[PDB]
Amino acid sequence: EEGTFLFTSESVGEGHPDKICDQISDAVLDAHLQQDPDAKVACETVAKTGMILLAGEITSRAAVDYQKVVREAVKHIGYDDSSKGFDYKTCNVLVALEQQSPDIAQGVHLDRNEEDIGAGDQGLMFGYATDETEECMPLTIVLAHKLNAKLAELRRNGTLPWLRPDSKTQVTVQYMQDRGAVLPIRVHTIVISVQHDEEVCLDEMRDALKEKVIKAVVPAKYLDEDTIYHLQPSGRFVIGGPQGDAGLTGRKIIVDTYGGWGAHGGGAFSGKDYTKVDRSAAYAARWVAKSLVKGGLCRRVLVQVSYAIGVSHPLSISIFHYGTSQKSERELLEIVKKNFDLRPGVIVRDLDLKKPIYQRTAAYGHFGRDSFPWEVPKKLKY
Amino acid sequence: EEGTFLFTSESVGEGHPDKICDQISDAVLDAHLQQDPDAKVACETVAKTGMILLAGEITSRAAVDYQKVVREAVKHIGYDDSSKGFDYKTCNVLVALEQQSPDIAQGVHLDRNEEDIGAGDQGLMFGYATDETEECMPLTIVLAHKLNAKLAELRRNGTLPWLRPDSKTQVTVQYMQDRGAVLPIRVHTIVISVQHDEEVCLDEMRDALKEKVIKAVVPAKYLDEDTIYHLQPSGRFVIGGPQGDAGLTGRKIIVDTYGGWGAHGGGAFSGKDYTKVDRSAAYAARWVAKSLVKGGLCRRVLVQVSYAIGVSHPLSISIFHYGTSQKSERELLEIVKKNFDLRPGVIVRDLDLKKPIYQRTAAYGHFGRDSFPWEVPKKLKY
Numbered sequence: 001e002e003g004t005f006l007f008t009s010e011s012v013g014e015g016h017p018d019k020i021c022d023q024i025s026d027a028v029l030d031a032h033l034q035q036d037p038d039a040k041v042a043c044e045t046v047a048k049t050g051m052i053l054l055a056g057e058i059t060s061r062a063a064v065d066y067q068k069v070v071r072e073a074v075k076h077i078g079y080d081d082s083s084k085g086f087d088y089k090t091c092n093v094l095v096a097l098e099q100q101s102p103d104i105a106q107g108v109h110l111d112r113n114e115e116d117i118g119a120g121d122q123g124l125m126f127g128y129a130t131d132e133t134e135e136c137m138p139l140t141i142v143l144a145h146k147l148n149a150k151l152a153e154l155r156r157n158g159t160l161p162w163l164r165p166d167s168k169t170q171v172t173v174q175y176m177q178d179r180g181a182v183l184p185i186r187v188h189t190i191v192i193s194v195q196h197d198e199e200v201c202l203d204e205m206r207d208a209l210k211e212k213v214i215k216a217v218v219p220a221k222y223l224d225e226d227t228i229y230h231l232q233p234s235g236r237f238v239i240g241g242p243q244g245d246a247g248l249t250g251r252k253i254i255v256d257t258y259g260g261w262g263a264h265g266g267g268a269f270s271g272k273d274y275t276k277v278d279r280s281a282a283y284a285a286r287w288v289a290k291s292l293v294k295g296g297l298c299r300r301v302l303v304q305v306s307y308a309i310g311v312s313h314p315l316s317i318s319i320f321h322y323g324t325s326q327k328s329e330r331e332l333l334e335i336v337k338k339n340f341d342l343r344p345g346v347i348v349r350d351l352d353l354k355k356p357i358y359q360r361t362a363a364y365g366h367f368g369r370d371s372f373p374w375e376v377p378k379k380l381k382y
Numbered sequence: 383e384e385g386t387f388l389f390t391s392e393s394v395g396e397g398h399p400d401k402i403c404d405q406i407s408d409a410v411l412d413a414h415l416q417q418d419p420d421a422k423v424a425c426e427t428v429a430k431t432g433m434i435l436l437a438g439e440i441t442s443r444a445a446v447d448y449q450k451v452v453r454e455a456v457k458h459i460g461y462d463d464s465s466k467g468f469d470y471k472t473c474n475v476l477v478a479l480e481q482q483s484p485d486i487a488q489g490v491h492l493d494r495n496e497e498d499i500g501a502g503d504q505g506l507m508f509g510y511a512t513d514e515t516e517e518c519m520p521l522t523i524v525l526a527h528k529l530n531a532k533l534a535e536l537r538r539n540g541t542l543p544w545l546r547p548d549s550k551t552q553v554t555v556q557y558m559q560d561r562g563a564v565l566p567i568r569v570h571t572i573v574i575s576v577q578h579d580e581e582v583c584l585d586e587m588r589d590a591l592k593e594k595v596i597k598a599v600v601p602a603k604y605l606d607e608d609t610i611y612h613l614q615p616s617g618r619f620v621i622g623g624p625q626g627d628a629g630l631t632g633r634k635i636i637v638d639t640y641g642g643w644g645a646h647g648g649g650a651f652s653g654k655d656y657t658k659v660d661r662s663a664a665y666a667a668r669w670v671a672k673s674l675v676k677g678g679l680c681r682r683v684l685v686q687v688s689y690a691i692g693v694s695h696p697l698s699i700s701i702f703h704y705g706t707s708q709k710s711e712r713e714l715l716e717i718v719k720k721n722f723d724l725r726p727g728v729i730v731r732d733l734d735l736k737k738p739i740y741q742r743t744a745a746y747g748h749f750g751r752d753s754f755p756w757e758v759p760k761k762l763k764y
């Protein structure tokens with residue numbers, strides 16, 4: 001049919017080595033915020049065979065047991081034995097952490113009123129919302145996330161005990177163009193790759209991934225005789241987690257956001273306190289986009305903001321409504337300016353960004369779940 | 383004026399700690415390809431005070447002196463003394479490199495005809511082109527890159543000897559909407575932050591950044607009395623490079639591509655051989671997008687592709703022309719299918735991706751310069 005197109009998004013499981021790093025970075029952030037709500041945290045994680053390395057800058061009054069925080073995060077993910085390729089009990093935890101650069105500290109937050117704190121860096125950030133789901137997220141990324149959540153569920157409840165924590169999923173949806181909005185028609189292609197034990201055969205895994213994972217997640221109305229299934233397409237995935245592939249914090253920024261929809265400014269979320277606008281301004285921009293769609297001002301919208309290090313107010317704000325509003329982009333920009341204050345020192349109050357809830361964000365995407373403050377739309381006056 | 387909007391892009395200098403990691407990762411890739419054109423390389427770099435760590439997976443017949451390759455890359459960037467916060471002569475180089483997972487190797491390339499090699503991973507990748515510049519790149523990212531190149535030029539020629547290698551730039555352009563294409567009107571805001579010595583005062587630096595950097599890069603026709611300048615907005619940037627901020631490979635993926643324009647699938651380029659579609663398919667998608675614009679089929683275009691690990695052919699191809707073609711998106715998709723083969727085993731031939739030219743790509747963006755093979759448009763038959 002004319003007016004239709006394919007769009008592909010991916011997601012990864014909690015044991016994906018990049019996602020291990022995100023969760024550890026946010027476990028460290030949460031440990032600091034639990035004792036010091038004003039902790040300055042820039043914690044990068046690196047994961048390879050037998051190694052978690054923490055690298056970065058933390059200035060905090062907190063007393064944090066990095067060995068305990070890191071190992072407890074790896075335990076939760078499910079890497080608890082050499083047979084699985086990684087073990088929280090016996091892995092190396094290396095720490096290369098120093099205080100925040102005093103040059104950054106003096107430029108950003110020292111002797112500044114909290115509301116008037118400088119952005120922790122320059123950068124650009126986008127928020128996106130789409131009416132194609134209730135949670136205002138693209139169906140492609142929602143389904144990809146849910147397939148990884150289903151794998152973790154069936155691993156943890158023991159129904160597929162051959163599963164290991166490292167997984168990736170990919171969903172291609174055929175969409176109908178609808179006056180600048182998008183309507184999902186069908187699932188065109190699904191990929192699932194998941195780490196597994198040496199006992200289970202490829203046919204058992206492929207049958208289980210179709211019958212127990214895909215059918216348990218993707219509504220039958222989206223699946224048909226033409227839907228393509230790439231299930232364990234590598235043929236073998238015994239070696240996995242950090243052993244199979246080095247992981248780093250902030251290497252899943254598209255999985256973390258909109259699955260390639262909307263736009264991205266390049267900033268990583270995990271391991272960063274609210275003064276890092278890479279996180280706080282991206283959460284705020286999601287909040288603005290979702291408020292515009294839930295407020296009925298547009299079906300689809302993209303918000304861009306940008307900052308300079310040491311400057312409170314955004315340098316630029318931009319609204320792109322994909323032709324899905326009766327109001328002009330200028331009118332929507334004026335509504336945003338009347339209703340939102342995107343200084344990081346105000347966002348922290350509105351979104352409660354000193355609360356140690358960050359490890360919860362670091363798998364299955366930061367947006368479209370659990371009614372986090374940035375997912376509760378603001379009632380707009382105009 | 384109605385029909386106008388702001389768009390912001392950033393770039394970073396060669397000494398930005400994330401960009402140090404990209405250049406080292408690609409220095410390592412090039413060293414392998416110089417001896418073994420079929421080297422399988424997945425080299426992550428981590429940079430913090432006094433440390434370069436290599437982490438990842440390399441299977442290669444090459445004999446590579448990692449100490450020499452890493453230190454020569456850091457020397458070229460200009461970190462050659464403790465006074466600058468980092469020194470190629472005396473820094474720690476740690477190596478955590480293993481062979482490629484045999485499970486990946488058997489699934490992707492072992493006993494496979496080169497043309498029919500599997501994608502090295504699943505994933506999605508985008509190519510973008512815009513007629514707003516001759517090189518088919520957004521003006522925002524082009525200017526941001528050139529400001530960092532100008533800083534490196536004036537550091538290396540000794541005209542601003544107080545400059546250090548770590549820099550960031552950000553350019554906001556006011557655009558006119560033109561039937562789905564974009565026309566730059568003016569530069570709204572410029573940010574420049576650059577690491578400097580203890581001798582030079584803030585006023586000298588700000589004067590020099592305006593008169594010797596901005597006026598040397600940005601045409602006067604884009605600058606006016608209302609243009610906003612944030613020059614050394616932190617007030618002090620003596621501590622810099624890895625000492626100021628931990629760096630990782632693949633944490634500048636938006637700087638590497640379109641500066642937030644177009645779209646991104648999440649994949650990092652640097653440290654990866656052609657079998658990693660994160661790089662090869664993104665280069666190929668840029669090549670397709672630039673061929674469509676230079677072929678006169680559209681003013682602006684976005685290409686999405688996606689892959690499954692172990693599968694040669696893309697799972698999905700999608701064309702979005704922003705309403706800037708007389709041809710439908712379906713017709714452009716058919717032209718792409720007739721003219722391009724986006725198997726990684728064919729892209730490697732068309733774009734010469736075994737050639738050790740990758741360190742050249744790892745600063746100032748991978749697209750819109752130096753007539754790399756993916757920047758030479760293909761003559762289209764239709």
Ligand SMILES: CC(C)n1ncc2c(C(=O)Nc3ccc4nn(C)cc4c3)cc(C3CC3)nc21
Nearest residue numbers: 177178179180181260261262644645686700702
């Ligand atoms: C920048 C990326 C993420 N990005 N942002 C939007 C799109 C669309 C898109 O929205 N297409 C539509 C949707 C609705 C429509 N109504 N009408 C009348 C025409 C329409 C066209 C498509 C792609 C494919 C992957 C290239 N990417 C997009």
Ligand SMILES: CC(C)n1ncc2c(C(=O)Nc3ccc4nn(C)cc4c3)cc(C3CC3)nc21
Nearest residue numbers: 262263304318320559560561562563642643644
């Ligand atoms: C997904 C991001 C990177 N993305 N992709 C396109 C845009 C545009 C955009 O192209 N707007 C235009 C351009 C030309 C036009 N002609 N007509 C008649 C209407 C038009 C609207 C704007 C923004 C701002 C930052 C929110 N982001 C965009």
Ligand SMILES: C[S@@+](CC[C@H](N)C(=O)[O-])C[C@H]1O[C@@H](n2cnc3c(N)ncnc32)[C@H](O)[C@@H]1O
Nearest residue numbers: 193234236237244245424439482485486502503
């Ligand atoms: C394919 S690996 C990336 C390439 C790898 N660094 C290399 O050396 O070729 C990327 C991700 O795919 C998954 N993966 C690892 N081994 C795999 C296998 N044998 N089959 C399928 N997916 C695998 C893991 O989630 C891993 O983080």
Ligand SMILES: C[S@@+](CC[C@H](N)C(=O)[O-])C[C@H]1O[C@@H](n2cnc3c(N)ncnc32)[C@H](O)[C@@H]1O
Nearest residue numbers: 042057100103104120121575616618619626627
């Ligand atoms: C601001 S730092 C990121 C935050 C940092 N990790 C922290 O602990 O707060 C990000 C980048 O900004 C630049 N930067 C470092 N120190 C700076 C300073 N004093 N002023 C301005 N920019 C600086 C460097 O390019 C660095 O990689």
Ligand SMILES: [Cl-]
Nearest residue numbers: 121400550627
């Ligand atoms: Cl940065």
Ligand SMILES: [Cl-]
Nearest residue numbers: 145146149364
């Ligand atoms: Cl979920």
Ligand SMILES: [Cl-]
Nearest residue numbers: 245424503660
């Ligand atoms: Cl990877």
Ligand SMILES: [Cl-]
Nearest residue numbers: 297325326327
């Ligand atoms: Cl409306």
Ligand SMILES: [Cl-]
Nearest residue numbers: 018168245503
């Ligand atoms: Cl990956």
Ligand SMILES: [Cl-]
Nearest residue numbers: 527528531746
């Ligand atoms: Cl340049």
Ligand SMILES: [Cl-]
Nearest residue numbers: 042121278627
């Ligand atoms: Cl950063």
Ligand SMILES: [Cl-]
Nearest residue numbers: 679707708709
């Ligand atoms: Cl045309």
